[model samples]
Target: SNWNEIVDSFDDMNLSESLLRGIYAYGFEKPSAIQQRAILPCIKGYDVIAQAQSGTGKTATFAISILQQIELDLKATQALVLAPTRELAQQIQKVVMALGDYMGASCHACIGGTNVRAEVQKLQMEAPHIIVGTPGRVFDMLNRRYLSPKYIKMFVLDEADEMLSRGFKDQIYDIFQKLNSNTQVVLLSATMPSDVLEVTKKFMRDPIRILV
Candidate 1:
């Protein structure tokens, strides 16, 4: 099969050698419809809001972006991703590790029901390129100075609408405020309400809306 034939179907996206290697390693020759649409804008460093339901290839959409932004040379929490639940946090971490396997990028997770001290220690030692965690634990670590959002270039919020509906909006808002002004934001939700759009308009700058 022609890998290029599959991947080049994307009008805007041009995959790099390393990214193509990663995709091939993962057994994906073709980009999904959502991937084809979002990859280019994301590679261009545009803020994106993707509305893709469960099992609709949501993780791959963001995973590609995460891999694209990784700088193997400079290390220090360059990307931060927030998930609403512990399970989702773990899942995001797995996705990062798989997509970024060749890059050798470091990552750390901060979540509730885990020992904060242990997580903090991981932050200090690893100085992760990416962080995947929930809202409250992330803010708590920031408050305690164990984790810093200073070097963060990209911020991802997965299942964003669910977090709001489940009463994690304040914590999410807090995380949003702490990031650097230039941070590229991506909001992913299986479903979005008016309030989510309101928040995105207020926080994101001319975001690219991708609905599938």
Candidate 2:
């Protein structure tokens, strides 16, 4: 099949029972159109470009993917999600924490405008399972060795268009370069701007494109 077959029900997505209840508790009864198609490939470690509108549950889609792939016991940064602003990064962090609450999932917002030293201490103490961060600060942390890219299994760009349009492409590339080679890259953009889609060629291995 050119694309993974779509599944209507969230149960059919092969989620853990805890996370399945996680989403249900969050009031997501069924997969949205994008969720039906993108969730499977993402969890399976495939590069995915999920193009959909802003409010169509894009946050939860990638959040759930990382939640499923993360090893709760490992307690390292297994997933890295880069968004445009600190607010968005924190917002994504909230969703990630909520979804993984049952499984003792730990996620941290690694954005700037706070103290970098404090951030480093928090990361070391938390050993966050996932990182939801903005591009510049994340890059800084990576260079400082405060955040290790070695354990990241899933690398996500929430609103890739915004990141690129805001001139974060260079930072994004640097961040990706620092991550482990086999990391799964997931791009969720409201618009599939060619500038954003082009990353699938350079960074993504073989993206399963999901449009809605």
Candidate 3:
């Protein structure tokens, strides 16, 4: 459905200048095809699964939509994004932080080989609006009661196949059990195996799946 209404809706989002600047700094003048088409639907709180090849600006597709929905006045972390590796976790944090620069939003990363206590302390200062982290470290925080999704409005699982193939299925399930029913879930990956679809069907409700 190529709808002009979708384009008009996206134009009305009113993204902050800082976010636009950051996006431009990354050398993106127009939204990627995937971004342009998916942004409006994702902003509407519809659970989405976007499958795309790496290097096709997949992160930006999700990041832009997340920033559009962030609440600057909220104290607790509203969005939780999971990455397969520590490097990817750090990368996601940078993208999220830069996109949220003008919104006065804070993002934190929890990954193995980092300071757990310091991460917990960060949660105290002001609950971040978003968190990007690895499954193991995220699970560690949850097990100790340092993190809770009771207030989460959105949850993201990036590189889903890679995460599960790396043996993070249990941790992912545990994370799901912690989120409230109102949370919007997004699953983006370069690949979605049968196993992945099974897990998603168990937790998601009528998610719109897209592949590009």
Candidate 4:
């Protein structure tokens, strides 16, 4: 509700200098209506459910929030963003890396059909700050101890509705149940059904609901 109030600029959001610089470098002159409302709450460490149409800057909203929250020194996957498909998963990786360029943050896409050994070696050599992936591959990494859940601070569901659908719901739950209870969960979707909303309530800790 408080987020409904106007936020004029990213400068007013009290982000780190690195994040502010990255925001500009990302070529954003101003926050979208969704970004203005969703970004701040997410940065404050609130679980947020953002409902907005595609291309309304929802990806950037969570990307900026996750970027600001990353722990560069303690590099492990501090943030996990899930998408329904490998294509979307890779897109999220690009958005995160682009926004986090100035911060020297790294993101990896753990999609299906990739070389697991190569991915594992990459993670071993340099732990990424963020991981964007489809449910199955991400869960596989977790199962194999390639990606540690110990440092993960947030779990972002990009296409929240599709991710929770019958197709991917089981795997989503499997990965989620293994995360730390304190892990912040942010869900972004154009539409959320009552059933899906109810299920998320079971895992989230008093999430801030934002509709735009």
In model 1, the runs with Cα more than 4 Å from the true position are: 1-12
lDDT tens readout by residue for model 4, 59-114:
88999999999888886779988898888998888888888888988899989978
lDDT of 2 by residue, 75-141 (tens): 7889888999999998998888888778788888877879878778887787788888899988998
For model 3, name the residue pairs that clash: none
- Candidate 4 regions with alpha-carbon error over 4 angstroms: 1-5
Instruction: After the best TM-score superposition of candidate 4, give how far the Cα of residue 152 lies from its true spot, in angstroms.
Output: 0.8
Pairs with backbone N, CA or C atoms under 3 Å apart (clashes), candidate 1: none
Query: What TM-score would every model get versus the actual structure?
Result: 0.90, 0.95, 0.91, 0.95
Better candidate number, 1 or 3, judged by TM-score: 3
Pairs in steric clash, model 2: none
Model 4 clash pairs are none
RMSD for each of the candidates: 4.2, 1.4, 2.3, 1.5
Rank by lDDT (best first)? 2, 4, 3, 1
Ranked candidates, highest TM-score first: 2, 4, 3, 1
Give candidate 2 misplaced runs (Cα > 4 Å).
none
lDDT value for model 1: 0.78
Q: CA lDDT of each candidate?
A: 0.78, 0.85, 0.80, 0.85
Candidate 1 TM-score to native: 0.90
